[PDB]
């Protein structure tokens, strides 16, 4: 084992320890592209989770001008400021693959603002923050995703990462109300007569069903235009793209048939996995 081959292992811990999802599809790719995957998604974690290190901006900021610095010079030996480990695989990415940086600075930008979260008024405020916070990451890993990108393939690969995010909101609707956040927008929860709090505290009644369900028509229809245009990406990630999207979407169903609990993360358990892989993978 090389020192670089200690940083991309540790990346792939991260991702293994995060998203059991995530990790068992991406790990099926080619071993360069897979590395690759794990460099960007361990990145990315360290971004979401960077506030609560000290309780500021600090290690954000050092995580900030990493990538700064490998983007301006991405040959050059750098000192960095965050986890080297993580860096010095992403650089090493970096050096074979053309890395949308202004994705990873949109990404921080959400995560800086998500400080002074305010309730979303609209839900186009709702998608705007999918994007910032998953949209984003999948810009950031097109490039690795597909032989020849072009706009479509940016394009679906930010759907995907926008449909994505908005599964993990309807999954973890009770546990983001304890920590003093709600993702559903005021307009929709006037309109559906949802009051989160009321909810959390005396259990699920039609109109909160109706809200949940109304956000995962757009989750799904999103999912199968993603399906739809699954050819934007290379012909071995498309079964893996596939697999990841379909093991995720499944939260959904997970969700409908805990009654759509706010009081536990609903999960799909590795053997629905392995029965998802082994449907995609006879279809490929
Ligand atoms: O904002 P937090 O902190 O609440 C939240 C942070 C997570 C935000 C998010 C949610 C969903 C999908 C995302 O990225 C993708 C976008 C497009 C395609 C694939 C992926 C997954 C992927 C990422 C990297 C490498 C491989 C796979 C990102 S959480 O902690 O994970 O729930
Ligand atoms: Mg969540």
């Not at 940086?101 to 990404?107: G, R």
């Amino acid at each position: 084992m090389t020192m670089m081959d200690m940083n991309f292992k540790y990346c792939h811990k991260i991702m293994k320890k995060h998203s059991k999802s995530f990790s068992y599809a991406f790990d099926l790719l080619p071993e360069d592209q897979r590395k690759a995957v794990w460099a960007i998604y361990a990145v990315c974690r360290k971004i979401d989770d960077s506030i609560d290190v000290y309780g500021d901006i600090q290690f954000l900021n050092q995580i900030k001008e990493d990538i700064q610095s490998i983007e301006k010079y991405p040959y050059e030996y750098h000192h960095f400021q965050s986890d080297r480990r993580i860096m010095m695989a992403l650089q090493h990415v970096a050096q074979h693959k053309n890395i949308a940086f202004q994705s990873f600075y949109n990404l921080i930008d959400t995560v800086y603002k998500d400080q002074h979260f305010t309730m979303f008024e609209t839900d186009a405020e709702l998608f705007g923050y999918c994007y910032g916070v998953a949209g984003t990451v999948g810009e950031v890993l097109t490039p690795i995703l597909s032989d020849h990108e072009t706009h479509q393939t940016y394009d679906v690969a930010r759907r995907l990462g926008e449909s994505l995010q908005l599964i993990n909101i309807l999954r973890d609707v009770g546990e983001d109300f304890e920590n003093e956040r709600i993702y559903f927008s005021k307009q929709r929860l006037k309109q559906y007569e949802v009051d989160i709090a009321e909810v959390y505290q005396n259990g699920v009644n039609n109109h909160y069903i109706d809200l949940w369900e109304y956000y995962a028509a757009i989750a799904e229809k999103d999912f199968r235009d993603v399906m739809d245009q699954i050819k934007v990406f290379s012909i071995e990630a498309q079964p893996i793209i596939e697999l990841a999207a379909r093991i995720y979407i499944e939260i959904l169903d997970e969700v409908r048939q805990a009654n759509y609990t706010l009081h536990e993360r609903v999960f799909v358990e590795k053997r629905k996995k392995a029965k998802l892989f082994h449907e995609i993978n006879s279809k490929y």
